Design a protein around this ligand. Sequence first.
Ligand SMILES: C[C@]12CCc3c(ccc4cc(O)ccc34)[C@@H]1CCC2=O
Lengths: 124, 124
Amino acid sequence: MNTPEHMTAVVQRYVAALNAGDLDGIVALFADDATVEDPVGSEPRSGTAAIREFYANSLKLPLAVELTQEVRAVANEAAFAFTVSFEYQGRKTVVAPINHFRFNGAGKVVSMRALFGEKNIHAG
Amino acid sequence: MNTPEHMTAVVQRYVAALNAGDLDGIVALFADDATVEDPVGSEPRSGTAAIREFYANSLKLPLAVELTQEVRAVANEAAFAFTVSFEYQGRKTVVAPINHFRFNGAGKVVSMRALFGEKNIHAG
Ligand SMILES: C[C@]12CCc3c(ccc4cc(O)ccc34)[C@@H]1CCC2=O
């Protein structure tokens, strides 16, 4: 089993990598055969190449990312509440999802699902 | 598809029924083939009898439950952050999970998962 300390560390790294625009740092969190379903209900990207391209695209504009509550971490999974903030053509948006990671025995994320809908997207 | 509004309203009803100690009210939100997995990593309870038992056990102590952020809801799924507090023999415990619901086409919950570990529990 993964430790809750390791899984919580991974969540914090993930948030810091997004704030820094650190693409390699984000990708290095995932297993080679991971999948990302973001948002939930959308079609999953799987494998390093699709996931790296997903994140490269998610970084086109500067992001401000905050963890907004403690991480929940048990068995081999973690879930966390956060906000992502960005501005485009002078319009500020704040998206507030809850994401879920499942981790493999080597402590990499094999699965991320990002749960948020239109209700969870707000103005500056 | 379920509307986010209907899922959101169900999360609220769930929370209100736990506060009221209203067992029938909680169990009326689930499909008769629903599963509950709580804690995540434990063995999923399946079907109306096991679901009603899980809840009747939870309700042996009065619970104070409150959502602590907006509900996230999309496709046929919702996730929510909250606290549940209870007290037994002057010892008070506060737990802060993140739960996840999936809903069927009738608008009933077909799966709940409560994600939290020891680090999300505070007893004193
Ligand atoms: C199960 C639960 C989430 C976690 C939880 C509840 C009640 C008592 C608890 C006691 C614990 O030591 C740890 C977790 C819980 C809630 C009752 C309804 C619900 O969703």
